[PDB]
Amino acid sequence: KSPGDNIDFQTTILSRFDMIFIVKDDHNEERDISIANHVINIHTGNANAMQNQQEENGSEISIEKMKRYITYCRLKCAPRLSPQAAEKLSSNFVTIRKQLLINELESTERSSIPITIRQLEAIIRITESLAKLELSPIAQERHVDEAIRLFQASTMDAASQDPIGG
Amino acid sequence: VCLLMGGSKKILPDGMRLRGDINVLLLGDPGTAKSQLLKFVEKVSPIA
Amino acid sequence: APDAVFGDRVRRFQEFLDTFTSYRDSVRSIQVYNSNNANILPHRIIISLDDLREFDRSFWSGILVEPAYFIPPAEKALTDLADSMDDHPWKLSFKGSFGAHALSPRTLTAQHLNKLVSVEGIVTKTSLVRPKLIRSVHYAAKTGRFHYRDYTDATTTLTTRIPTPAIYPTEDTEGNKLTTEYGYSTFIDHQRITVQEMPEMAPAGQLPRSIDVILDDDLVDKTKPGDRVNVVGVFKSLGAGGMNQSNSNTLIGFKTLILGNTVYPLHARSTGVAARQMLTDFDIRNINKLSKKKDIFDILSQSLAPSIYGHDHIKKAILLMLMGGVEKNLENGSHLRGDINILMVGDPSTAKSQLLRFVLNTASLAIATTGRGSSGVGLTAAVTTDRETGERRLEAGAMVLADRGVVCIDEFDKMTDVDRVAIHEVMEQQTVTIAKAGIHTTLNARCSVIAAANPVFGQYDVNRDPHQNIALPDSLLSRFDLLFVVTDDINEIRDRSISEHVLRTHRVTIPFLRKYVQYAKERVIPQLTQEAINVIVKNYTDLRNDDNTKKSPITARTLETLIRLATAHAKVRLSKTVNKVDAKVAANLLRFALL
Ligand SMILES: Nc1ncnc2c1ncn2[C@@H]1O[C@H](COP(=O)(O)OP(=O)(O)O)[C@@H](O)[C@H]1O
Ligand SMILES: Nc1ncnc2c1ncn2[C@@H]1O[C@H](COP(=O)(O)OP(=O)(O)O)[C@@H](O)[C@H]1O
Ligand SMILES: [Mg+2]
Ligand SMILES: [Mg+2]
Numbered sequence: 108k109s110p111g112d113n114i115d116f117q118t119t120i121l122s123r124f125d126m127i128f129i130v131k132d133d134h135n136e137e138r139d140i141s142i143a144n145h146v147i148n149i150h151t152g153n154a155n156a157m158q159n160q161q162e163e164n165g166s167e168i169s170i171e172k173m174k175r176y177i178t179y180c181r182l183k184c185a186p187r188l189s190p191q192a193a194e195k196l197s198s199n200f201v202t203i204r205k206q207l208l209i210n211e212l213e214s215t216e217r218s219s220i221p222i223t224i225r226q227l228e229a230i231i232r233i234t235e236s237l238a239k240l241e242l243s244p245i246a247q248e249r250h251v252d253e254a255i256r257l258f259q260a261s262t263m264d265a266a267s268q269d270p271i272g273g
Numbered sequence: 274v275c276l277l278m279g280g281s282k283k284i285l286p287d288g289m290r291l292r293g294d295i296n297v298l299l300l301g302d303p304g305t306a307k308s309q310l311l312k313f314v315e316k317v318s319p320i321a
Numbered sequence: 322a323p324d325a326v327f328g329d330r331v332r333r334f335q336e337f338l339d340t341f342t343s344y345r346d347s348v349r350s351i352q353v354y355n356s357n358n359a360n361i362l363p364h365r366i367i368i369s370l371d372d373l374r375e376f377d378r379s380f381w382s383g384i385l386v387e388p389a390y391f392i393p394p395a396e397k398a399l400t401d402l403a404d405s406m407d408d409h410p411w412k413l414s415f416k417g418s419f420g421a422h423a424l425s426p427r428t429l430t431a432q433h434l435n436k437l438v439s440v441e442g443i444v445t446k447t448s449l450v451r452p453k454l455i456r457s458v459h460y461a462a463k464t465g466r467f468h469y470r471d472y473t474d475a476t477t478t479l480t481t482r483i484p485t486p487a488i489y490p491t492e493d494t495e496g497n498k499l500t501t502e503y504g505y506s507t508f509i510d511h512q513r514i515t516v517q518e519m520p521e522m523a524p525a526g527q528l529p530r531s532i533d534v535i536l537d538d539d540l541v542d543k544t545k546p547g548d549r550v551n552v553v554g555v556f557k558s559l560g561a562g563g564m565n566q567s568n569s570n571t572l573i574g575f576k577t578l579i580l581g582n583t584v585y586p587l588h589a590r591s592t593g594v595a596a597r598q599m600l601t602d603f604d605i606r607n608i609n610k611l612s613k614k615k616d617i618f619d620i621l622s623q624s625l626a627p628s629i630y631g632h633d634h635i636k637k638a639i640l641l642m643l644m645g646g647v648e649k650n651l652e653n654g655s656h657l658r659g660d661i662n663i664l665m666v667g668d669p670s671t672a673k674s675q676l677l678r679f680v681l682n683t684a685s686l687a688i689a690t691t692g693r694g695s696s697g698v699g700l701t702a703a704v705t706t707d708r709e710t711g712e713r714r715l716e717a718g719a720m721v722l723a724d725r726g727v728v729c730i731d732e733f734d735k736m737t738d739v740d741r742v743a744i745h746e747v748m749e750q751q752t753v754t755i756a757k758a759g760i761h762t763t764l765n766a767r768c769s770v771i772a773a774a775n776p777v778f779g780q781y782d783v784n785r786d787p788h789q790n791i792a793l794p795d796s797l798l799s800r801f802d803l804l805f806v807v808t809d810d811i812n813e814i815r816d817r818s819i820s821e822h823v824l825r826t827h828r829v830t831i832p833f834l835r836k837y838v839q840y841a842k843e844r845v846i847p848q849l850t851q852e853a854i855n856v857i858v859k860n861y862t863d864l865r866n867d868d869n870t871k872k873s874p875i876t877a878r879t880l881e882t883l884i885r886l887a888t889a890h891a892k893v894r895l896s897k898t899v900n901k902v903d904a905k906v907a908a909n910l911l912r913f914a915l916l
Contacts, residue, residue, distance in 0.1 A: 110300070119669045119779050123296065130301035170317050177277055178319050185281045188828060197820040201813060208811035217780060223670035223809070224823065231827055232280030232295055240278050257275070287831060288682040289628045289675060 109268055111219025118219050125229035126261040127220070186238035188231065192251045196234070199255060200227050203263075210270045220265035229262075230254055277318060330380075330394035331401075337376055338402055344368065348403050348411075363539035364409050366399070367583075370417035384415075385422060388437045388555050389479040414583040415553050426518050426530040429556065434577065439553040441587070442516040444546050445531065449710070452508035459490060459499040468499070475559055476535060476580065510541040516552060521589075533578040543584045546716075548594055554581035588685075593722040595686040597839065604836055611837075612895040618906075621837070621893070624829040626679045629672050630819045634913055638663050638803050639680060641910075642727065642769055643838050644892045646885035647846055658751060660769040661885055662800065664733070666791055667807035668780055673773040677729050680771055683831060685839065686726030688719050692735025695719055701743050701753050705760060713759050720747050723768045733772040734793065741797060744770075748800040770801075781808050787872050795874060802882045803914050804873050847891040847898050849884070856904035857883045864915070871915050883907050 110129060111118040121127065148154050163169065168176075188196075207222050234254035238246035265271050275295060282293035299307045315321045338344060347366050355362050373381045383391040392413065400411045419439045426442055459468045470490055475482075491499055517531040534552050536543075544550050562575040588596040611617060618637070625636040641661055648659030665673050681689050690700075698704035702718035720728055746752060753764040776782070777792045787806075791798070798804065861880045886907035891899040 113300070117779060119775075121298070122669055124298040125295050126297050128297070128299050128301070130299070130305050130307065132302040132305060174317055174319055181279060187281065188824075193824040193828070197817065197824060200820050201816050204811050204816045205813055211811075224819070225670055227820065227823055228291070228827075229295070231824075232293060233275055235280045235293070236275040236278045236295060239281070240274070283827060285628055285826065287627055288679065289626065291827065 109219045110265070111268075121219075122221055122223055122225065125226070125232065126258070127264070128261050129264055129267070180239055180242065184239050184242050184244065186235045186244055186246050188234065188246055189248075191248050192234060192246055195248055195251050196227070196230055200230070207271070210273050213273060214270050216270055218265070218268050218270045220262075220268055220271070226258075226262065230258055233257060277314070327394055330391060331398045333377065333380060334395045334398040335402070337373070337380070338398060340376065341372055344399075345402065345406075348399075349406060352403070352407050364403070364411045365414060365539065366411070367414040367416055370415055370419065372417075374417075384437065385419075386436055389435060393479060412582065416583070419553075425522070426516060426532045427523070429532060433556050434558055436556060437553070438556050438579070439551060440516060440532065440579070441549075441551050442518050442531070443520065444544050444548045444550050445515045445517045446546055447515075447544070448513045450510050450512050450541050453511045454506065455509055456507040457489070458502040458505040460502055461493050461497050461499055463497045464493070464495075467502070467505075468493070477537075479555065479557075479580070509538055512536045512541045514544070516550060519549065534581045535578055536581050536584070540581065540584055544586055545593075547592070547722075549587040549589050549592060551585040551587055552579065552581050553583040553585075554579040590681060591687070591689050593686070593717070595726070596835070597685070598832070598836055600836060600840060604833075605840070607833075608837055608840055609895070618890070618893060620829060621834070624834055626676055628826050629675060630822050632672070632676070632807070634910065635663075635665070635676065635805055635807075637910065638805070638914075639676070639771070640893070641886060641889045642771065643684065644841060644889045645769070646888040646892070648767070656751070658749070658881065659885060659888075660751070660767065661882075661889060662748060662769055662802045663771045664798075664801040664804045665771075665773040665807065666776060666781070666804070667773070668809045669775065671807045671809060673807075674731060677731055677771065677773055680727065681729050683835070684727045685835070686723065687729060688723045688726070689729045689731070690719055691730070692732030696737070696740055700740055701747075701755075701766075702764060703753075703755055703757075705757055715755065715760065715762070715764075717764075720744075720766050720768055721753060721764055724765050725767055727769045727771065730770065730772040732775075734774045741794070745797070745800065772801075781806065786870070798873050799876055799878050801873070802878075802885065803911070805914055806872060841892055841895060845892050845895055845897065847888055847896060849888075850899050852901045853887055853899045853904035856901055856908065857887065860904075860908040860911075864911075869916060873915065879911070883911060886910060 111121070114121070145154075148157075159167070204222055207218065211217060230251075234246055234250045237250045237253055276297055280293035280295060283291040285291070299310075301307050344366050351362050351364065351366075370381065370385075373384065380391065384395070396411060396413055399413065403411050415437065419437075422433070422437065423439045423441075424433070425440060429438065429440065455472060457470050457472075460466075461468070468490065470487055472487060473482075473485070475484075493499060512535075514534050514536065515531055516534060518529045523529050534554065556577065556579055558575045558577050560576055563570055563573055586594050588594045611620075614620070618640075622633060622636045622640055625639060638661075642663055645661060646659040649657040651657075665676075667673055677689075681687050698718065700719050702715055702721040704716060704718075705713050706716060707713040746754070747766045747768070748770060751765070751767045753766045755762055755764070774791070774793070776790050778790070782790055857880065861883060864879065865875050883904070887899050887903045890903040890906050894903065
């Protein structure tokens with residue numbers, strides 16, 4: 108069934124969000140074993156010390172420090188795109204909408220996960236957000252690469268939709 | 274991470290506001306740890 | 322007896338009035354007007370604290386921190402000048418920068434007592450305007466003479482005085498009876514109001530704070546409940562906080578309030594106070610110049626919300642609604658509408674709410690509502706309250722407040738029948754009728770409407786008729802003057818172009834538009850011309866007798882819509898009559914919206 112059918116409200120509400128994450132519970136022997144090992148390790152008390160008390164020495168942050176750092180960055184920085192990022196974003200958006208149009212005209216039904224301008228500003232906001240945490244007043248195509256990868260990973264799992272197939 | 278950081282807002286000469294916050298939705302089956310993520314975000318954000 | 326400090330301060334303020342010549346000619350102009358036109362203007366002028374600051378810092382600080390010692394001298398000096406220059410005593414008002422003395426009811430504390438302050442907030446409740454007896458006059462029948470007496474109280478002077486509680490005289494000094502002469506006595510108006518902290522500034526979840534303000538004479542009815550107001554006055558205390566006599570109780574303190582002297586209404590979004598700007602000769606010249614260009618309509622249309630791509634016809638319609646037509650009142654007592662209404666049905670990412678919020682931000686008087694946000698008594702003012710004097714009264718609603726303005730409704734299709742029947746009368750008769758227990762009245766609700774709606778199936782469908790896509794009563798659609806349908810069809814070139822536009826944004830100004838609209842609405846009232854009569858008649862006949870399937874029905878409301886649109890376009894043109902071009906433009910817009 109289409110993702111629109113799976114939800115219990117008007118499908119236009121999905122048009123408001125920037126990123127969507129349909130997480131499925133697939134059964135797998137090795138993954139089940141790994142998650143079980145992780146959970147019993149947490150309950151026993153090793154994960155309380157291991158990793159958490161060793162990654163705090165260089166490769167992990169405290170919760171209070173992270174909170175303060177978020178406040179700092181929010182107050183201080185406000186990035187802005189660069190022309191290369193702008194043109195790349197424009198081209199990607201046009202290609203995505205072209206593909207969706209072709210799929211829709213190939214059939215008589217409309218997709219349940221539409222693509223609109225909101226997604227354009229969503230990618231814009233995502234790239235600027237990635238730029239901000241580095242405190243860089245300017246964002247280059249390296250940020251747009253990651254932004255598009257995140258978008259494809261999250262929102263463009265609308266390929267599970269029926270017209271989108273093709 | 275991108276959500277907590279947030280985008281950049283723009284105020285235009287005509288009065289229109291281009292928002293800079295990010296919205297995210299989580300579809301999934303039961304028992305995928307998508308409520309603990311919300312709880313952690315609540316505990317780690319300055320205002321939540 | 323005379324005081325030397327008082328006289329020195331009077332002399333210094335007279336020097337101040339001498340160095341600056343604007344207030345002098347202001348007083349002269351008020352006196353000239355009152356002499357020539359006899360309406361009577363009140364004897365008052367406004368002073369700038371900034372100029373006082375450059376002139377004499379000591380006197381500035383004295384007025385700011387010790388008004389009770391420095392202001393009466395200034396009023397006496399002003400009165401002396403006024404009495405000397407002409408062929409009631411005068412009062413003063415203060416403007417400029419108050420520095421640290423600009424506060425709100427929450428941040429007004431006991432350390433500001435006896436000093437001049439300026440507070441901001443929302444008016445919550447006023448009082449009945451009452452007369453106060455100042456001088457009585459009497460008559461003795463046995464002797465044929467007239468007498469009088471004067472009365473005073475603690476709030477008529479800034480400095481403390483020894484009380485003199487005079488009694489009301491019924492007899493003469495020789496025992497004879499007296500008769501009251503109500504026509505020869507003197508009464509002064511009086512009111513009391515309450516000011517609270519603004520809803521858009523007070524902390525959330527916390528109970529608010531408020532302060533009382535006392536007004537007298539010529540500042541008695543300058544605001545109504547719900548307004549945003551700025552009041553400048555003296556924060557003062559009165560009486561004895563239980564000190565006199567034993568008065569074992571210690572919980573109460575000293576009564577405090579503000580003896581106001583300046584009241585300024587402030588305009589905000591979604592409020593009942595309308596915005597007005599002062600028009601200078603430079604502005605008038607520029608407006609009257611731009612009136613003579615041929616693409617003036619195009620420029621004014623493209624100026625609206627330049628951040629949105631396209632929707633040119635909706636921009637034109639919004640401009641036409643902003644300008645408006647003319648309403649007619651026949652001697653018989655009939656009324657003919659003159660407002661314009663707009664509706665928008667479109668796809669769920671077509672920037673409907675952006676244009677709606679633009680209209681909210683730009684109109685001089687607008688109120689924003691949403692589908693289920695306000696209902697029942699919240700729209701027609703159908704709620705009843707009562708005074709502590711006993712009487713029951715009404716308080717205005719969304720559309721009652723927005724009389725002579727515009728109302729923005731979002732999620733229009735989410736309403737119900739109970740309020741749609743209510744809004745029928747507003748949209749056609751432009752009146753609100755209430756009949757409850759102890760009330761029978763009729764309120765004026767002359768307002769225009771702009772709304773946005775969603776299609777039934779989430780997205781507009783071209784394989785079905787419009788009736789299956791809009792799903793709204795026909796009688797309701799007949800009351801909307803224009804209905805627009807907007808759809809987003811994927812197109813490589815259009816998507817590209819809108820992409821570069823949205824990227825440009827992310828990396829004529831409004832004030833001149835507001836001035837233009839205000840001048841045009843206030844000054845111009847065109848008349849109908851035979852040419853436009855023929856054009857509109859032909860167009861109405863053709864539309865009524867055509868086989869095309871429309872987005873809305875055709876009635877006499879369409880003919881009246883044609884007249885209204887033509888008159889509004891002529892109003893844009895600053896012309897005193899309607900020509901053929903305005904009628905043709907109205908017909909073209911109506912045909913485009915319909916087809
Ligand atoms: N992938 C996972 N890794 C570690 N723990 C998990 C995982 N998935 C579920 N859990 C466990 O399940 C609990 C969270 O369940 P819950 O928040 O109810 O999920 P949901 O909100 O999706 O129903 C946690 O206490 C956690 O220990
Ligand atoms: N024609 C357009 N021009 C510019 N921006 C647009 C246009 N259409 C949509 N958008 C963008 O998409 C968003 C749509 O938001 P909204 O006004 O709520 O649309 P709707 O009310 O139709 O859902 C806006 O933030 C706006 O920036
Ligand atoms: Mg859960
Ligand atoms: Mg909207």
